[PDB]
Amino acid sequence: SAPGSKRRSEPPAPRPGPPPGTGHPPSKRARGFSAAAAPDPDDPFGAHGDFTADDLEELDTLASQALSQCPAAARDVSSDHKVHRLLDGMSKNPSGKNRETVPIKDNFELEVLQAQYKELKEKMKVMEEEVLIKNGEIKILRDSLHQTESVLEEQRRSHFLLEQEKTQALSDKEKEFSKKLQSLQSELQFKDAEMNELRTKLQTSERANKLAAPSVSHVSPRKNPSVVIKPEACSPQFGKTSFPTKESFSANMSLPHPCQTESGYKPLVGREDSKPHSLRGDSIKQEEAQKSFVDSWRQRSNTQGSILINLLLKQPLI
Amino acid sequence: GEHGLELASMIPALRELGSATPEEYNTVVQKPRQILCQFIDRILTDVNVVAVELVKKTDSQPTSVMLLDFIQHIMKSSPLMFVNVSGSHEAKGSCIEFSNWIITRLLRIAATPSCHLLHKKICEVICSLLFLFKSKSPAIFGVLTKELLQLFEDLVYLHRRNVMG
């Protein structure tokens, strides 16, 4: 009755300690495909509509241990296609349970670290199922890994011909328009989504984002003039990355004659105050001693951003 | 004629780094070098498609190899040139391909660091690793690699930093 999570931690604890031992990573698909029967083929029956291991007990989260097994031994293409026809069996069909929220994240995070590892195409069909199985009222962690979900897919969704990118041209920042996020990690979920927004060039932004979820991000950013403190060590860098969004708006609105902002001078208002606070982000004390990374936030990530302050003064000037 | 205008001083910038016997001539070389990024600041970029975009990046990467050749013994001048090179890619509105090529430039030394496990030698390559160490500081000054943090980013190069560990 008192061995719920500690005894369940011993699986990856055994897995990572042997991962931290010795040579090449063919063990990433050796013991895993052996152990792949223990959950996924243990959930293979699908008694309608309930899998055999998944929808009986809550301890069907060894996929996170399989994600930990995906995180165990990193070379070079092994466990993913070894779980490929297993996930096309299990995780393709046993993911649209439409609530799933007990490790619905780690279900996707299994595919995320799969897509993080290597490959191009087998997960690129699986993102259509994530394009299929989506939600706008997901859980706060289910929205959180969803921001990571297209993020790990974005590298092959910007591989050469972008391969999945216009599949979510309606499943764009519309999904970031699932607003009213939770506490600062869910605020940082948008910051990772801002970090996810670096690719995908700016032809048709008005149907996809219209900088309107970015205005909702600017709504967070207009708050962010004084919304955070000492997680501002995250959040002002997230504001410094929000300064890239105006530079991204500089590469979109001041690209060819859009200006992109109708009811957003109110939004660019405190953004201009945040542009006033852009170079004034690390200007409380400003001593000449720096341990490893202190003053470079509003100096070097303000070198481009004071330009981006003038490029917040480019589509609509200062 | 922009590349021909870029051809005018870059070989002269390749010339002033030849004699590494300065007595404030590297100061007279950095005053050409640090102004050259300021000459690269207002113009000589933001231009035609990926051939000419790589062509402005070619003599950039050629002078970055000359900056990589600047291993002994003007260290911080190359570090001044490190963010100066990063200022171009910051002002590129582009060069995420070149950032992946900078990630490949990180991967150029990474497998070389992985080859430095069984065999580290040729102290210039130890010095060019120190030139790449300020490029890691330039990657620290880049921080648009965290704009590629969605793509399973420089944790790879942190493993190279673990290989530098």
Swiss-Prot record, chain A:
Post-translational modifications reported in the UniProt record: Phosphorylated by ATR.
Ranges of Low complexity composition bias in the record: 32-50
Tissues with expression: Ubiquitous.
Region (Interaction with CINP): 114-152
Recorded coiled-coil stretches: 104-213
Disordered: region residues: 1-53
Localisation: Nucleus
Listed Pro residues bias regions: 11-23
UniProt comment concerning the protein's domains: The EEXXXDDL motif is required for the interaction with catalytic subunit PRKDC and its recruitment to sites of DNA damage.
Family to which the UniProt record says this protein belongs: Belongs to the ATRIP family.
Function in brief: Required for checkpoint signaling after DNA damage. Required for ATR expression, possibly by stabilizing the protein.
SUBUNIT field: Interacts with ATR. Heterodimer with ATR. The heterodimer binds the RPA complex and is then recruited to single-stranded DNA. Interacts with CEP164 (via N-terminus). Interacts with CINP.
This protein's name: ATR-interacting protein
Originating organism: Homo sapiens (Human)
Underlying gene: ATRIP
Residues of the full protein shown: 5 to 322 of 791
Swiss-Prot record, chain B:
Any coiled-coil regions, as ranges: none
PTM characteristics: Phosphorylated.
Tissue: Ubiquitous, with highest expression in testis.
Compartment(s) where it occurs, according to its Swiss-Prot or TrEMBL record: Nucleus; Chromosome; Nucleus envelope
Implicated disorder: Seckel syndrome 1: A rare autosomal recessive disorder characterized by proportionate dwarfism of prenatal onset associated with low birth weight, growth retardation, severe microcephaly with a bird-headed like appearance, and intellectual disability.
Similarity section: Belongs to the PI3/PI4-kinase family. ATM subfamily.
Subunit structure: Forms a heterodimer with ATRIP, forming the ATR-ATRIP complex. Present in a complex containing ATRIP and RPA-coated single-stranded DNA. Binds to DNA, and to UV-damaged DNA with higher affinity. Interacts with MSH2 and HDAC2. Present in a complex containing CHD4 and HDAC2. Interacts with EEF1E1, the interaction is enhanced by UV irradiation. Interacts with CLSPN and CEP164. Interacts with TELO2 and TTI1. Interacts with BCR-ABL after genotoxic stress. Interacts with UHRF2; this interaction promotes ATR activation.
Biological function: Serine/threonine protein kinase which activates checkpoint signaling upon genotoxic stresses such as ionizing radiation (IR), ultraviolet light (UV), or DNA replication stalling, thereby acting as a DNA damage sensor. Recognizes the substrate consensus sequence [ST]-Q. Phosphorylates BRCA1, CHEK1, MCM2, RAD17, RBBP8, RPA2, SMC1 and p53/TP53, which collectively inhibit DNA replication and mitosis and promote DNA repair, recombination and apoptosis. Phosphorylates 'Ser-139' of histone variant H2AX at sites of DNA damage, thereby regulating DNA damage response mechanism.
Protein name per its UniProtKB record: Serine/threonine-protein kinase ATR
Native organism: Homo sapiens (Human)
